Every structure is written in structure tokens, then in C-alpha cells.
Write an enzyme that holds these catalytic residues in place. Structure first.
Site, PDB file in Angstrom:
ATOM      1  N   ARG A   4       0.823  -1.222   0.000  1.00  0.00           N
ATOM      2  CA  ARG A   4       0.000   0.000   0.000  1.00  0.00           C
ATOM      3  C   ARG A   4       0.851   1.264   0.000  1.00  0.00           C
ATOM      4  O   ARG A   4       0.618   2.176  -0.789  1.00  0.00           O
ATOM      5  CB  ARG A   4      -0.879  -0.016   1.237  1.00  0.00           C
ATOM      6  CG  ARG A   4      -2.123   0.839   1.212  1.00  0.00           C
ATOM      7  CD  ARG A   4      -2.941   0.561   2.465  1.00  0.00           C
ATOM      8  NE  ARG A   4      -2.950  -0.864   2.778  1.00  0.00           N
ATOM      9  CZ  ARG A   4      -3.777  -1.769   2.258  1.00  0.00           C
ATOM     10  NH1 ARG A   4      -4.751  -1.421   1.414  1.00  0.00           N
ATOM     11  NH2 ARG A   4      -3.649  -3.044   2.619  1.00  0.00           N
ATOM     12  N   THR A   5       1.793   1.317   0.932  1.00  0.00           N
ATOM     13  CA  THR A   5       2.784   2.374   0.983  1.00  0.00           C
ATOM     14  C   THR A   5       3.611   2.366  -0.290  1.00  0.00           C
ATOM     15  O   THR A   5       3.753   3.384  -0.945  1.00  0.00           O
ATOM     16  CB  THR A   5       3.724   2.184   2.199  1.00  0.00           C
ATOM     17  OG1 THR A   5       2.949   2.076   3.405  1.00  0.00           O
ATOM     18  CG2 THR A   5       4.651   3.361   2.368  1.00  0.00           C
TER      19      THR A   5
ATOM     20  N   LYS B 210      24.305 -12.508  -0.798  1.00  0.00           N
ATOM     21  CA  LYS B 210      25.762 -12.578  -0.996  1.00  0.00           C
ATOM     22  C   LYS B 210      26.565 -11.848   0.124  1.00  0.00           C
ATOM     23  O   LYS B 210      27.765 -11.679   0.015  1.00  0.00           O
ATOM     24  CB  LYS B 210      26.150 -12.156  -2.440  1.00  0.00           C
TER      25      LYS B 210
ATOM     26  N   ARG C 194      11.889   0.954   4.120  1.00  0.00           N
ATOM     27  CA  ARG C 194      11.047   0.454   5.181  1.00  0.00           C
ATOM     28  C   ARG C 194      11.703  -0.741   5.822  1.00  0.00           C
ATOM     29  O   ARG C 194      11.891  -1.771   5.159  1.00  0.00           O
ATOM     30  CB  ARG C 194       9.699   0.051   4.620  1.00  0.00           C
ATOM     31  CG  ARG C 194       8.731  -0.422   5.686  1.00  0.00           C
ATOM     32  CD  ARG C 194       7.294  -0.204   5.255  1.00  0.00           C
ATOM     33  NE  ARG C 194       6.489  -1.347   5.561  1.00  0.00           N
ATOM     34  CZ  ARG C 194       5.170  -1.397   5.506  1.00  0.00           C
ATOM     35  NH1 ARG C 194       4.416  -0.348   5.164  1.00  0.00           N
ATOM     36  NH2 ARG C 194       4.593  -2.550   5.807  1.00  0.00           N
TER      37      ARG C 194
ATOM     38  N   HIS D  44       6.035   6.695  11.123  1.00  0.00           N
ATOM     39  CA  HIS D  44       5.478   6.487   9.788  1.00  0.00           C
ATOM     40  C   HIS D  44       4.908   7.806   9.258  1.00  0.00           C
ATOM     41  O   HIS D  44       3.686   7.965   9.091  1.00  0.00           O
ATOM     42  CB  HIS D  44       4.389   5.436   9.844  1.00  0.00           C
ATOM     43  CG  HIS D  44       4.131   4.744   8.537  1.00  0.00           C
ATOM     44  ND1 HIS D  44       4.309   5.355   7.313  1.00  0.00           N
ATOM     45  CD2 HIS D  44       3.648   3.506   8.267  1.00  0.00           C
ATOM     46  CE1 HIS D  44       3.951   4.527   6.349  1.00  0.00           C
ATOM     47  NE2 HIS D  44       3.564   3.390   6.899  1.00  0.00           N
TER      48      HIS D  44
END
Lengths: 304, 299, 292
Positions: free
Chosen positions: A61-62, A89, A110, A138
Site C-alpha cells: 500500500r505504501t 551474498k 522500510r 510512519h
């Protein structure tokens, strides 16, 4: 970092860095950017700039809104799937975040970990726009939750805000709840007692309630939240499954000049039959974020 | 000077007049961006990304590159692809060749790439193979070497780390033979003495060294590499082939240290204008724009 | 179709398809000569695929990207996976069309049902695949001059066959003789309506049904229920008893059913088949969004 209001280059990491003159502008941008789209006006605004998406939590959504947002102003977006990235890696997160900072002009990161974001942001040749951390900030969510609150009800000041659901863990509710303190609102709760202390300092009311059925008659915004069955009370669990739920049967004792919001995702907390109900602004909430990001991304890149 | 349609599979196919051009394109494309000039260059054309190794530098740069000239990019996730219904790699690569105008393929297998390239209605730009090339890396490692130090000819090149497996070092090390440079090697006793016969043949000097602390005083480029202690069977191997900022004090001041990346503990994190490994990453993006654009006839 | 959902092949007319085809050629030929296509510049497409694909989605991606639009890479794996509708509608907030593909019986119909924005099928559990069927025609029409009159050899495992029920049914808008080639294991369910509108005949293998064949439509089997594998296979040696004014098609993916050395053969239109979809999507997406 000069006269007027401008985030140009600024990182966007916590909600502490926003002013009311900035946000109103930040809102005045979104409507203007929205309305260009509504009428189909070209937006070569971030044409040629690039956004690097970096999400280590599971979202859609974000990031999507962010993707739509960048893609709408003319820009492009770097899919970064850590699963298929040089992390398989042994590479530093900074190493990557900075690496991506070589190929892009902003960043949208995020991370769940306590402040993995602050770090990655800290040293970065390019700006970073939070979307989630482990500390719970947020800003983009909080930011967008306002336009909804302002758009939906005419003004922000005066509103009483029923935040419902599991709030302890709640990482979205610390972002808005705190920031709400830039307005004149009575906060109700249906919460982390630690940062509840900053809010009440500035007089922003704070009262606990038994359920929605009681706290609702003086409610201008019903902010809802996912609980999680697993992690609840213990054996007993039951009614609190059903109580902190908004059926359309509850919504009849609710104000008529009021709107119910959800950051999302959801499951059974808001009854699917509550979809088709004008006072239901949780889907339009999702829509209006896309324009905060356009309102933000665009500004954060100096093209507005 | 023109690759228009040419596949880009091994580093053997580059000339010096081409590369200098290929470099002269990159700066020009770079400087358009630095000022903010529109680039409708590959507007309309499409790139199909196909990566079966795990990367996020070649592909990203490639993505930024295509997106910057105006083009679009096909996110091809094998994980979510008809491979899970099980169809041929060529089948896919050609299928994608139906929806795109170039291709960027990266495969570990010995010559999965050569194959897929072989028959393709559309051109393929290597990004990795088993056998064992990386032209775009080699290509970009030069501009860094040329940009960073003024010229390429004359430089002495300390390539450090585990080189045996090293698939990037065979791409540059060979190609370096188009210049007048003294190659030095720093490895844990365990460079492949196969490809090495070719470079030293042409008199591109080649000498083995104990560590960095010895080979560094006559070093113009310190090319670093991830070891892989997944074949140690040795914490001196760990700590010797490592560049702390404390080693860097016995290092030339008119010198630059490079890394293809990724890295881990080999280069100390630590504030050194001689540190051109991050700018290395940045400058690839422009080889791809320098390449993609040319490989598609829009420049 | 402006705003119309695209869910089953039942909703297409011949005047629509022919237009739908007349668009594709015109959109194709713009690209062939390199004409700007700011057609869906500013609109956005939300890709939502729960099956594993890389032909429908890619074509769809190329298609959207070619008209000037952008595409939402939606990976359920890295998504809030909340309701499917919840997501599909959520994505309906950020986009202007949708391309959904779900295996479940009628997960698609549902998600489509309520949607502020239009939904273009790409697969369901019922087996309907309008864009494939749609595409398969232009190939058939382009490749052979006309559609009417052609005899169509559909070969392979057809029972499970989800693409063959999309085209086989829709083919009934034309005058064609349908032939069938299957391992005794076509679903005699939908076949209640196929022969209603008038030819269908079963055959032993390709080596018999091929001499009156205008289109050899091939399909992936399922060693999972031998000769039933080497019979329903097109080697280059079989292809010599096949018409010269005929073309062999495959929706794809494939494996060993069509012999790799059948690639380089001017009667081989299965790769150009894949190419021509991209233009039904441009032909469709563009129309479905009112920009053509």
C-alpha cells in the site's frame, strides 16, 4: 534549508520535522496535483529523476502508492527485491542503500529493525523517506491520515478522535497520535503509556474507553486497527475479538457527520458490509496517500 | 564505431576506438543529466531484464540507465515465471525477445548465455556467465580508471583478493591488455593460471605479491575482491587481503582503490578521496546508457 | 468497451473483434515506423497475477509501457498477504485498469464484480482466457488471409486445456471445421454448445488429421494420469505431410511436444503468435481506457 518552506533534500524520518505551514502547503500541493490528474494534465515533474524502493517488511500500500505516485509525475521506480539481491551474498544494508543511492535520486526505505532506517538514512548522498521503522514512526501515513481527516470533515481542529484496536504494538498510531498535537482535538483510546506522556503535555485530551459502543457518540474520526488474534489475552480473547469490531450494526449509534478510517491492512475488524457506507473513508484514505507521496516526493526533489 | 544490433557477450569484441567513443558517449549522457536535459533517446523501445544469479548493481544500473534515456524495463522474475510450469530458457528468452528490443541476461551456468544469445531476434548484453565474462563491468572499470587517474596507459594495477573464482577480474584483466599497464596480483595461494597465459603474452607485466602492504607503493589502482572463505580448508588470508584505513597510509596519494562489489569485511568502511569504489558503481549506469543507447541505434 | 470489464469470451462480437484487430494493426504499424504513443500516458495499470506466468503479463507490461503508461508490479509474495478484493480494490485506488489472473473458481469474477476500475481477465479456474483466444485469431486471420473456411487441428491434452475452451468456443463466430487430437484420457462439458451452432471430429493423431488442416493448434500435455506423448508431438519429419498453406500455433509454454528443430520453419507461427498478443493488449488496454 532556506527561506519559505522547503524540504528540498531533507530526509523524512520522523514526524517531528513537520510544521503546520509546511503540511497545509504539503496538502495544498496534493489537491493541486490531484486535480491535474482528474483533468489529465501532463506531469513531466519528476521526468528523468528516479526513485529507489527499498522495503524489508511485507507491504503493498505504501510502496504501491509510492510507485503510482512516482510513475504519475513522470518518474521511474527501482524494484528492489532483497530476496533476489546481493544480500544473498553478504552485503551491508548501508552498502546496498548507498549503492542504490548511486542509481536513484530519492529513497523509500522500510525496515522493521530498531532504527535500521535512521542508520541507512544517516549517511546517504541522496534523501530517504521513511515508510516504517521498529521505533514505530510512519510520517507519510500520519501525513495522509490528516488530509483524510481535513478533507472528510471540513477542518481538523475540534475533532474528537476514536482510535480503536490493538494500539500497544501500533506503529501507525504513534505517528498520527503525536502529530495530531498540532491541532485542537480530543483523543480517545479504545496504548503505549510511554509516549502517551508527550501528547498529554500539550493538553491534547486522552481518555480510555470500554469499547466503540460507548466512545462513539462524541466521535469525529473512528481510527481502526488490526489486532492480531494470536498475541491476545489467553484462554478467555473471545469478546475483544468481537468488541473492537465495527459491524454496520454498531455504526447506527455513530455520528452522521463523522468518518471512519483505517490505515490498512484489515481482515475481520471492519465488517465487509461496512464497505458501502458513505461515512466509510478507509478506501479513499488509501487513495489520498498516493497524493501525499506526489505531494512529498515532488517537493522533496525540488520540482515543486 | 557502431554495435547497432550486435550482441555483447565477451570482452573480446571491443576495440579502443570503440571504447573511447563508448566513453565519450557516457560523459556526454552524464552531463546531460547533470544539467537536466530531456532524453527521449530510447523512448518507446523496451528492455527485458533476465537475471538468474543474485544481483542488485548490474541490474539496477541497467534499470536506471534504461529508465533515464526514456525507456521501460521488464521485471522478469523467474520465481514467478513459467519456469514454475517449466519451459526452456531459450523459450523464455526468445519469448521476451518478442516483447522487448534488447536483453540483459545473467546466468551462472557454463554458456547458458552464449546459447540464449545465439538465436535471438533481438540483441543480448551479457552481465555474467560461468565461462566467465563480464564486459559491462570491465567496460566501466576502465572509465573509473581513466576518469580517476587522468589516463589508463602507464598505470600499475594491484588486483587483490580471491581471484581464482573471480569472474570480474578475467573480464578486466584481459581487456587491460589494450593499454600499457603493469599488472600485479594479490591472492591466497589456492589468478587462474588458464586465462593468465593470454595477458602476459602481450607483455602486460604480471607479478605475484605477498599482500597489499608490499605491493602497494607502486600501485595506481587497487582493485579489491570478495574472498569467499567457503574454500579455505587463513585469518591472515582474512586480514592480509584487507584494506583498513591504516594500511591506506603507505599507499600512493595519486592512486585510487576500486571494488566491483558486493563487499563485506575486506575494505574497512572508512572519508578517503582515493576511495573510488562507490563512484565506480555510479559510473556503470552511464556505460549502460553509453551501451544500451548505442546498441539500439539511438546514438 | 470503455469501462467494460473483460472476463469471459462471451462478450465479444465480430464487429468488435475486427475493430479490436483493426486497432492492433494500426498500433503495430505506428511502432514499426516509430510513432510516438502518448496514448495511455498518465494512466496506470495494476498487474495482479496469482498463477505463475511470463507471457500474458510480459506482453501486458510491454503493451502498457509502449502506449506511454506505467505498470504496478504487484508481488503477492511481498504483499499484505487481507482480502483479495481488499487488495484488488486497494490497487483499484492507484491504477486505472487491472489485469488479474487467479486459478481459483471465480476468484476473478468476484474481484471484478465490485471494482471502481475495470478488470481484464488473464486466467480463471473456469478456464476462460479472452485475451489468448482474442490473440489466437489475429494469428489465424493474419497468417492465412481469412478466418472463415479454415479447418483447425487442436492437438494435445485438451481436457484440462484452459486456453482451448477460450478459442474453441469463440471460433464459432466463424465458418471453420474443428478437429480434435487428444489422449483418450476435449472436455465433453462445454462441447454441449460448440457443435450447436454447426463441424467437430476426433482423430487418432496428427499424422492422420493433418492433410485437411489450416491451423495446427498445439498444447502441453501432462505425463501425469508414452505414445500419448510421441504421437501428439510435431517433429520436423511429421511437418512434411502437412499443408503448405497452413500454420502451426502454440499458446505456450512448451517443452518437447514441438521439436526444437521446428523453430526455423515459415509455417511456424507460434513465436509470432506470442508477439501478436502484445498488440491485442495495446488494442484492448487502449480501448478499455477510452484513449482509443
Amino acid at each position: 534549508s532556506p527561506l519559505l518552506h522547503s524540504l528540498v533534500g531533507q530526509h523524512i524520518l520522523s514526524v517531528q520535522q513537520f510544521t503546520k505551514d509546511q503540511m497545509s502547503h504539503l496538502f495544498n500541493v496534493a489537491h493541486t496535483l490531484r486535480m491535474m490528474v482528474q483533468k489529465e494534465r501532463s506531469l513531466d515533474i519528476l521526468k528523468g529523476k528516479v526513485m529507489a524502493s527499498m522495503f524489508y517488511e511485507v507491504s503493498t500500500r505504501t510502496s504501491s502508492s509510492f510507485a503510482a505516485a512516482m510513475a504519475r509525475l513522470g518518474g521511474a521506480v527501482l524494484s528492489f527485491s532483497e530476496a533476489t539481491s546481493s544480500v544473498q551474498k553478504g552485503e551491508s544494508l548501508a552498502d546496498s542503500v548507498q549503492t542504490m543511492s548511486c542509481y536513484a535520486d530519492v529513497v523509500v526505505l522500510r525496515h522493521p529493525q530498531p532504527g535500521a532506517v535512521e542508520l541507512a538514512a544517516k549517511h546517504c548522498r541522496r534523501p530517504v523517506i521513511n515508510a516504517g521503522d521498529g521505533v514505530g514512526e510512519h510520517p507519510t501515513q500520519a501525513l495522509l491520515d490528516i488530509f483524510t481527516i481535513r478533507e472528510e470533515l471540513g477542518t481538523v481542529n475540534g475533532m474528537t478522535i476514536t482510535m480503536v484496536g490493538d494500539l500497544k504494538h501500533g506503529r501507525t498510531v504513534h505517528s498520527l497520535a503525536c502529530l495530531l498535537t498540532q491541532y485542537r482535538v480530543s483523543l480517545r483510546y479504545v496504548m503505549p503509556p510511554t509516549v502517551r506522556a508527550f501528547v498529554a503535555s500539550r493538553g491534547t485530551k486522552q481518555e480510555e474507553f470500554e469499547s466503540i459502543e460507548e466512545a462513539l457518540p462524541d466521535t469525529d474520526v473512528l481510527y481502526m486497527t488490526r489486532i492480531q488474534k494470536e498475541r491476545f489475552g489467553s484462554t478467555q480473547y473471545e469478546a475483544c475479538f468481537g468488541q473492537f469490531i465495527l459491524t454496520p450494526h454498531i455504526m447506527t449509534r455513530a455520528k452522521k457527520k463523522m468518518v471512519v478510517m483505517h490505515p490498512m491492512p484489515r481482515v475481520n475488524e471492519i465488517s465487509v458490509e461496512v464497505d458501502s457506507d458513505p461515512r466509510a473513508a478507509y478506501f479513499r484514505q488509501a487513495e489520498n496517500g498516493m497524493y501525499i507521496r506526489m505531494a512529498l516526493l515532488a517537493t522533496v526533489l525540488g520540482r515543486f
